[PDB]
């Protein structure tokens, strides 16, 4: 269950990272969510307990900005258009504003996932 991306395994070898950087750049350009101004972290699903809890631990300004971004993207998608070439999401603003909180929540849930399975080896 859950995405199983293996970028951490690849990043161990600098050879693979150096070889694969241009391909990743081209792929991210091809995916084309920046044309709507969205961040990558707005596309993750929020329908489980973990993400719904994580969204409640965000700073207020981040939540308001996310709401504005999603509303603007929907309004753009209504009339079948994209933002001009000057308002596209720059790489500087495409950071991970949701991964640490979700990771913390998952770690807390995983923490409890052990006491119940505890056995006495005697």
């Amino acid at each position: 269950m859950k995405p199983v991306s293996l970028a951490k395994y690849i990043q161990k070898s600098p050879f693979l990272t150096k070889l694969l950087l241009p391909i990743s750049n081209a792929y991210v350009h091809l995916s084309g969510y920046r044309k709507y101004g969205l961040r990558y972290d707005d596309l993750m699903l929020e329908e489980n307990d973990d993400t719904q809890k994580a969204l409640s631990r965000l700073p207020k300004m981040e939540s308001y900005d996310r709401v504005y971004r999603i509303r603007r993207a929907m309004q753009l998608s209504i009339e079948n258009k994209i933002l001009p070439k000057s308002e596209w999401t720059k790489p500087e603003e495409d950071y991970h504003y949701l991964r640490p909180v979700l990771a913390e929540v998952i770690a807390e849930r995983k923490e409890r996932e052990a006491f119940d399975a505890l056995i006495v080896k005697k």
Binding site: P3, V4, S5, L6, A7, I10, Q11, T17, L20, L21, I23, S24, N25, Y27, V28, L30, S31, G32, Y33, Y36, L38, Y40, D42, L43, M44, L45, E46, E47, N48, V67, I70, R71, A73, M74, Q75, S77, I78, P91, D94, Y95, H96
Partner: protein, 387 residues
């Protein structure tokens, strides 16, 4: 409080058709459900009307159909509309399934809706066969004889089930009586399952092409989406009336206007066009039991999709690999249909085997691999941007 929100039945109508929050940016591919409902209603009404002039027996069915055609008032409209609507039903069904597959609508929280839709698809396929087997022409007789013989593949009680279904030892009066009796009942079960489909869907709402939550922006269905479906309805009407009034026997093979002779075997025994790909998958495997197993799996594999998508994104809008592979799979499906339609000649056997292999590989190998690759590439590029 207004009346529409107070009276029970009016509240039931209002909660589903008038006042219901919907995503505000759903494209024209979200109208096919209303088209399916309209086609189902048309089929029910036309079948009820047609049942008043049809006698279900070996020696009277074909003559009854001909009398309907050339003696009953406006019978040609009835028969042509029934056949052409039954043909359009599968086109709209395939478009609905394609829409559900392309945008990743099988993911949570809409798995139950997907399963109910799969069950409805199986019921519709079963209903189509009995419906087309009624006129008792050449292809109906021989295709029924071939297909109902597939029940012998089960271990134990093998030919006993075939004899029980046939009601004798060969296709005769009793099996036509059984088929006519069953063809009347199944559409009502389909309608009930459609009601269950809708009531399961309504608890969480529809998705949108973007793939993000649509709780921020919503509009009521009453003024906006009740007028966006009218265009599709009128377009479907203009499509079906041309077929009914200028080419009624369009999708109909030449061998479907002759009496069922049980002594002359036709050159090709094929079912209707919309069941061709499954027939090709069945014919691909030299073994017998493996053939029916693969034919069943080709439709039962849609239930394994939710536990096969390892993608952080929900849909193919922002998935470069998915857009390519989806159209590749669609082309493979068309190739499978073409191969199944034609003769089992020399090169066609190899082409069909390769197409079947690709069809069963796409659902089992390609999807996890390319989803994982996309996730890894995006994550790596994002991680390697600050330094």
């Amino acid at each position: 409080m207004k009346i529409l929100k107070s009276n029970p039945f009016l509240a039931l109508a209002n909660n589903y058709m008038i006042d219901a929050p919907e995503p505000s940016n759903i494209s024209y591919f979200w109208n096919f459900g209303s088209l399916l409902a309209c086609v189902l209603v048309i089929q029910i009404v036309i079948g009820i009307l047609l049942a008043c002039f049809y006698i279900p027996n070996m020696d009277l069915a074909f003559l009854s159909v001909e009398r309907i055609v050339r003696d009953v008032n406006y019978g040609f409209l009835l028969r042509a509309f029934h056949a052409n609507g039954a043909s359009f039903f599968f086109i709209f069904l395939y478009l609905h399934i394609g829409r559900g597959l392309y945008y990743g609508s099988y993911k949570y929280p809409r798995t139950m809706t997907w399963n109910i839709g799969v069950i409805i698809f199986l019921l519709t396929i079963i209903t189509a066969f009995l419906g087309y087997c009624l006129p008792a022409n050449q292809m109906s007789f021989w295709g029924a004889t071939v297909i109902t013989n597939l029940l012998s593949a089960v271990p134990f009680i093998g030919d006993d089930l075939v004899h029980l279904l046939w009601g004798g030892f060969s296709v005769s009066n009793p099996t036509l009586n059984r088929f006519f009796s069953l063809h009347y009942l199944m559409p009502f079960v389909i309608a009930a399952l459609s009601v269950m489909h809708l009531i399961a869907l309504h608890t969480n709402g529809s998705s949108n092409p973007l793939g993000v939550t649509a709780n921020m922006d919503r509009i009521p269905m009453n003024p906006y989406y009740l007028i966006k479906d009218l265009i599709t309805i009128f377009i479907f009407l203009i499509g079906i009336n041309y077929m009914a009034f200028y080419n009624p026997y369009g999708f109909m093979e030449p061998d479907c206007a002759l009496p069922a002779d049980p002594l002359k075997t036709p050159m090709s025994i094929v079912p209707e066009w919309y069941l061709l790909p499954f027939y090709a998958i069945l014919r691909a495997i030299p073994n017998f039991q493996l053939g029916v197993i693969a034919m069943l799996l080709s439709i039962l594999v849609l239930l394994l999709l939710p536990l096969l998508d390892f993608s952080a994104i929900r849909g193919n809008s922002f998935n470069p690999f998915g857009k390519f592979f989806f159209w590749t799979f669609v082309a493979d499906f068309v190739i499978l249909a073409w191969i199944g339609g034609s003769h089992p000649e020399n090169v066609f056997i190899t082409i069909g085997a390769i197409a079947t292999i690709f069809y069963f590989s796409y659902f089992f190998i390609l999807i996890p691999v390319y989803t994982i690759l996309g996730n890894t590439l995006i994550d790596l590029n994002l991680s390697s941007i600050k330094r």
